Amino acid sequence: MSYEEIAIQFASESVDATTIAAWVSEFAYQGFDARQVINLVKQRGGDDWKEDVKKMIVLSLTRGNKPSKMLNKMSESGQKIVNDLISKYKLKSGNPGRNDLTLSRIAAAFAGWTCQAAEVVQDYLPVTGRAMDAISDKFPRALMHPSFAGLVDPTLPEGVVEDIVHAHCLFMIQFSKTINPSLRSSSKSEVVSSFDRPMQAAINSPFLTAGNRRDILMSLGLINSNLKPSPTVVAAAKVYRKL
Amino acid sequence: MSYEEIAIQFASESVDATTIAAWVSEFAYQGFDARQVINLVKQRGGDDWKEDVKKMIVLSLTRGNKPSKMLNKMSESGQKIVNDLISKYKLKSGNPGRNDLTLSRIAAAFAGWTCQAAEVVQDYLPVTGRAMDAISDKFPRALMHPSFAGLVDPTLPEGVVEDIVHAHCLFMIQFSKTINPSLRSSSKSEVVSSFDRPMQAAINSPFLTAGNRRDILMSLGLINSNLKPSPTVVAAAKVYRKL
Amino acid sequence: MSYEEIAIQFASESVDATTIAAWVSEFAYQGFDARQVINLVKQRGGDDWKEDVKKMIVLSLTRGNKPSKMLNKMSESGQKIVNDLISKYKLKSGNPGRNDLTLSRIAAAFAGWTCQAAEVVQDYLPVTGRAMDAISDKFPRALMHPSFAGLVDPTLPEGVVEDIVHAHCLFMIQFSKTINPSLRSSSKSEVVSSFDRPMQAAINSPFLTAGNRRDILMSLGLINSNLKPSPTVVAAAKVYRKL
Amino acid sequence: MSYEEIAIQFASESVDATTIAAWVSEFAYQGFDARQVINLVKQRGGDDWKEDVKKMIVLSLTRGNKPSKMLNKMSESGQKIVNDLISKYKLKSGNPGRNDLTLSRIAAAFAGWTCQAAEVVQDYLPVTGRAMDAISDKFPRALMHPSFAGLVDPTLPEGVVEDIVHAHCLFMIQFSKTINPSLRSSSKSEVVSSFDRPMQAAINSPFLTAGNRRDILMSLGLINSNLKPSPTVVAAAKVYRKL
């Protein structure tokens, strides 16, 4: 049997949809899973994990997602802390597997806290609160981090979802540019292409129920108990819409 | 004898065409060889190789050609399977030598099967069947993978070859863009430059005789027994030609 | 307690500004510190450190900041010297931590000397003295190195600071282009973006008092004792301003 | 003594021109040196070195300057030869130090032979003889390799040097594009920028006297004994000049 015959016969082999469907499932893309981040954090962090998480989130907010490159520009007291978190939590950088932790992932899993901390550390964010104020005045700090996306309640009146997203998008434009100078001249449709996929994924994620997300938005002052967004959020949405 | 003299004399050394021709042959570029892929698969895979090949091809269709980067976004049950294929077949990524296997190579060697499987896993392809439907309606799924090129019978009436290629090119445009975002704004002549060399190589490859390729195209419903392409294939060729 | 509940409760955890402020401090960005370069140089260099520093600075001026890539295009006598400096001072390349030395850092810490040496080795600089003469005649060599920025006295009459900076910027344009060919076609606002951040940082750095910087500028002949810049410096500032 | 004082005093340290000049010499850029390539080849190659050099040059002409990446697309008989040359001559790729050999360097050191071989292996060159024929008919194959630059006698009548260079430049345009697709759309002044520095260096190199270079050009049929270039070379120079 020549190689040719072998290849021809193979084209006549069964193509069973049922068996293949199962394989696709095994091979399926496994995305971000906040539940697994929380698992890893709890297992590795022991009893003091919550305090560790807050430290790691403040770390992420002010210094980004590369914990080793971070050490090359840090006081020696800070390094004792960061090296200790790295070891305890086996911290990685960039985009590894489902059993690895990153500052970004941790910040995302605990978004509701991340976004309150951003208000506190606003003067030390890649894009600053004041920097945003210049674009839209009194810009809501709770919006100023990518993890906010996971706090959006999509069952809200469509007009309101739209105002919240658009206001966050305005921040994401400055942010995405600041993190990738390759975009600082790109078009607005282009910059938005660089974050809208994972943004939509978090908006429509099954982690945190609609009610849960809504309750957090009310605590942040983003919407009142009557579902009406802050003037400050509508304002920023206007500026975004004058694209 | 100075270095100068040595270099001058060397310019007077023999330039024998016969001896050099042989050297060029030894040094010649050895391209893709489906026969050698089949060899390696058979040797390494033992008796269950065919089932393994199908698994590897479904893997390629849905997750691409980097099997290790693939593990970082896969369920744990899938990883047992993929790690096992990697070990058994010594799977590599990208473009290694003539004694190495890759998902892409395997998918290419068994193109006739690859292209039927793409119809089954169409909703999980980089560019989806429905996505193509928007560009040209009822777009033939059998075309939707680069390995299809090797199934083209070039001895067919030129008009028909042209319709089949052009229809496949329309898919290759979406595909090539989806795999390289650096092209998502490039011109159509530019995108096509990114795949037409290896495409032509497979169209004019001596692996699978004209009759063999033709027989597979008839099985796929791409042409009838009278050598006339599906309306659906002519349709897509029109859309490609309005470039 | 589900992962959901855990994440919700965590959003209600304390956000104490005082404790967080301290963390930001620990995690704060630690920039270039000339004092620490001098420390490392003194510790590692022993008694002959000053001569070593001069050698390392002449090295930087003529061959750049990558000491290993440098060895691949150096006489064998030079390599004995460079390998010896590398070992003694544990020389690194690019941008490492606060306990590492680089030619660039050393050249910057000792800017007042660096800029006199540039006058001596002007024909062997990336951008040459004569090359600058073509742009603005008799261009002041003391300006022709990035470390000059740290010698600027910002308490000077604003008009004078402006002339000194602008004249240095004209050099920095040629320099920045020569070091990054990716800019050789870029706009002038774009090239300037590639050096003005660290330039401003050194102009407004607390290392070297205003009086100290001013005294060095007078020694270099850049300003007279009456605070009036060289004609040659005003000249170059004009050319820069016709951007 | 504060760090400040130490830095101020250091600015008053001697700047002796004589001592510094010597350092610049030690640190000077050491470029390509054909004499040293010939040395390394002779030492490492033993008695059969000339045959080895010819093999290595035919290798360079048809497969480029990366000998390991080369093995991934080579017959198994060729690999026995190439691996043997690699070991014997300690072959490297890209741009290493003065004690390392590369196919490119070897081809350059023996340019007079390299350029005759290119005539023999013309159908297997990155840019082919026929490909050049389309641009300028009967294009002189002896020009079709970068090493040719070292064969130019610059003491020739300026008009003739100009015709020879320009004709070679036309090849270098196709070549430089073929090797760097990043240029396949670039302007002609831009492409030429990518090879004219080392080209000029070889034209004005002190390796091979004017008389030596001239004698080789006559052997190649590029000029007659009366210093008049082939019609075919003037022709190609015209096409280059219609830039």
PDB file of C-alpha atoms in Angstrom, chain A residues 62-145:
ATOM      1  CA  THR A  62       0.096  50.798  40.847  1.00  0.00           C
ATOM      2  CA  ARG A  63       2.718  48.564  39.215  1.00  0.00           C
ATOM      3  CA  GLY A  64       0.966  46.314  36.663  1.00  0.00           C
ATOM      4  CA  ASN A  65       1.062  42.576  35.971  1.00  0.00           C
ATOM      5  CA  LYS A  66       4.798  41.726  35.721  1.00  0.00           C
ATOM      6  CA  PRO A  67       5.921  41.055  39.352  1.00  0.00           C
ATOM      7  CA  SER A  68       9.560  40.229  38.537  1.00  0.00           C
ATOM      8  CA  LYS A  69      10.224  43.212  36.209  1.00  0.00           C
ATOM      9  CA  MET A  70       8.552  45.149  39.053  1.00  0.00           C
ATOM     10  CA  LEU A  71      11.397  44.296  41.501  1.00  0.00           C
ATOM     11  CA  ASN A  72      13.935  46.192  39.359  1.00  0.00           C
ATOM     12  CA  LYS A  73      12.417  49.540  40.377  1.00  0.00           C
ATOM     13  CA  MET A  74      11.296  48.940  43.951  1.00  0.00           C
ATOM     14  CA  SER A  75      12.549  49.918  47.407  1.00  0.00           C
ATOM     15  CA  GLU A  76      14.187  47.009  49.269  1.00  0.00           C
ATOM     16  CA  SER A  77      11.383  46.835  51.864  1.00  0.00           C
ATOM     17  CA  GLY A  78       8.776  46.478  49.110  1.00  0.00           C
ATOM     18  CA  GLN A  79      10.799  43.667  47.563  1.00  0.00           C
ATOM     19  CA  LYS A  80      10.634  41.611  50.742  1.00  0.00           C
ATOM     20  CA  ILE A  81       6.823  41.797  50.478  1.00  0.00           C
ATOM     21  CA  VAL A  82       6.517  41.198  46.717  1.00  0.00           C
ATOM     22  CA  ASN A  83       9.020  38.295  46.699  1.00  0.00           C
ATOM     23  CA  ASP A  84       7.024  36.796  49.558  1.00  0.00           C
ATOM     24  CA  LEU A  85       3.716  37.032  47.663  1.00  0.00           C
ATOM     25  CA  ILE A  86       5.395  35.615  44.533  1.00  0.00           C
ATOM     26  CA  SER A  87       6.647  32.593  46.477  1.00  0.00           C
ATOM     27  CA  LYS A  88       3.526  31.967  48.555  1.00  0.00           C
ATOM     28  CA  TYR A  89       1.127  32.281  45.589  1.00  0.00           C
ATOM     29  CA  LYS A  90       3.543  31.038  42.876  1.00  0.00           C
ATOM     30  CA  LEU A  91       2.903  34.272  40.975  1.00  0.00           C
ATOM     31  CA  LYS A  92       3.342  34.227  37.198  1.00  0.00           C
ATOM     32  CA  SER A  93       3.236  36.971  34.545  1.00  0.00           C
ATOM     33  CA  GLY A  94       1.296  37.281  31.269  1.00  0.00           C
ATOM     34  CA  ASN A  95      -1.088  34.466  30.296  1.00  0.00           C
ATOM     35  CA  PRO A  96      -0.420  30.947  31.754  1.00  0.00           C
ATOM     36  CA  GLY A  97      -2.724  27.953  32.438  1.00  0.00           C
ATOM     37  CA  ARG A  98      -5.721  27.267  34.722  1.00  0.00           C
ATOM     38  CA  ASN A  99      -3.579  26.372  37.736  1.00  0.00           C
ATOM     39  CA  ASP A 100      -1.531  29.583  37.771  1.00  0.00           C
ATOM     40  CA  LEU A 101      -2.181  32.922  39.479  1.00  0.00           C
ATOM     41  CA  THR A 102      -1.435  36.461  38.277  1.00  0.00           C
ATOM     42  CA  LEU A 103      -1.969  39.893  39.791  1.00  0.00           C
ATOM     43  CA  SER A 104      -4.404  40.665  36.931  1.00  0.00           C
ATOM     44  CA  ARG A 105      -6.427  37.496  37.484  1.00  0.00           C
ATOM     45  CA  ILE A 106      -6.593  38.054  41.280  1.00  0.00           C
ATOM     46  CA  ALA A 107      -7.618  41.703  40.712  1.00  0.00           C
ATOM     47  CA  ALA A 108     -10.320  40.481  38.316  1.00  0.00           C
ATOM     48  CA  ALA A 109     -11.693  37.756  40.597  1.00  0.00           C
ATOM     49  CA  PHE A 110     -12.139  40.378  43.312  1.00  0.00           C
ATOM     50  CA  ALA A 111     -13.224  43.228  41.042  1.00  0.00           C
ATOM     51  CA  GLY A 112     -15.705  44.661  43.556  1.00  0.00           C
ATOM     52  CA  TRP A 113     -12.814  45.412  45.879  1.00  0.00           C
ATOM     53  CA  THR A 114     -10.281  46.297  43.153  1.00  0.00           C
ATOM     54  CA  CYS A 115     -12.514  49.144  42.006  1.00  0.00           C
ATOM     55  CA  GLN A 116     -12.830  50.705  45.453  1.00  0.00           C
ATOM     56  CA  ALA A 117      -9.079  50.539  45.925  1.00  0.00           C
ATOM     57  CA  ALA A 118      -8.553  52.344  42.588  1.00  0.00           C
ATOM     58  CA  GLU A 119     -10.316  55.364  44.142  1.00  0.00           C
ATOM     59  CA  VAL A 120      -7.736  55.362  46.961  1.00  0.00           C
ATOM     60  CA  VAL A 121      -4.631  54.878  44.799  1.00  0.00           C
ATOM     61  CA  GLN A 122      -5.902  57.072  41.928  1.00  0.00           C
ATOM     62  CA  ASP A 123      -2.815  59.355  41.836  1.00  0.00           C
ATOM     63  CA  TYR A 124      -0.607  56.295  41.250  1.00  0.00           C
ATOM     64  CA  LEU A 125      -2.582  54.647  38.460  1.00  0.00           C
ATOM     65  CA  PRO A 126      -1.163  54.349  34.919  1.00  0.00           C
ATOM     66  CA  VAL A 127      -3.910  56.768  33.872  1.00  0.00           C
ATOM     67  CA  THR A 128      -4.634  59.073  36.811  1.00  0.00           C
ATOM     68  CA  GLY A 129      -7.962  60.344  38.202  1.00  0.00           C
ATOM     69  CA  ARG A 130      -6.985  63.939  37.408  1.00  0.00           C
ATOM     70  CA  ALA A 131      -5.895  62.856  33.929  1.00  0.00           C
ATOM     71  CA  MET A 132      -9.424  61.539  33.394  1.00  0.00           C
ATOM     72  CA  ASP A 133     -10.912  64.702  34.933  1.00  0.00           C
ATOM     73  CA  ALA A 134      -9.413  66.638  32.018  1.00  0.00           C
ATOM     74  CA  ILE A 135     -11.316  64.374  29.592  1.00  0.00           C
ATOM     75  CA  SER A 136     -14.567  64.285  31.592  1.00  0.00           C
ATOM     76  CA  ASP A 137     -14.841  66.132  34.892  1.00  0.00           C
ATOM     77  CA  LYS A 138     -15.322  64.243  38.184  1.00  0.00           C
ATOM     78  CA  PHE A 139     -14.770  60.978  36.257  1.00  0.00           C
ATOM     79  CA  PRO A 140     -15.911  58.036  38.448  1.00  0.00           C
ATOM     80  CA  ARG A 141     -12.811  56.262  39.791  1.00  0.00           C
ATOM     81  CA  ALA A 142     -14.693  52.978  40.306  1.00  0.00           C
ATOM     82  CA  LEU A 143     -14.641  52.665  36.497  1.00  0.00           C
ATOM     83  CA  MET A 144     -10.862  53.077  36.300  1.00  0.00           C
ATOM     84  CA  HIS A 145      -9.689  49.462  36.032  1.00  0.00           C
TER      85      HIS A 145
END
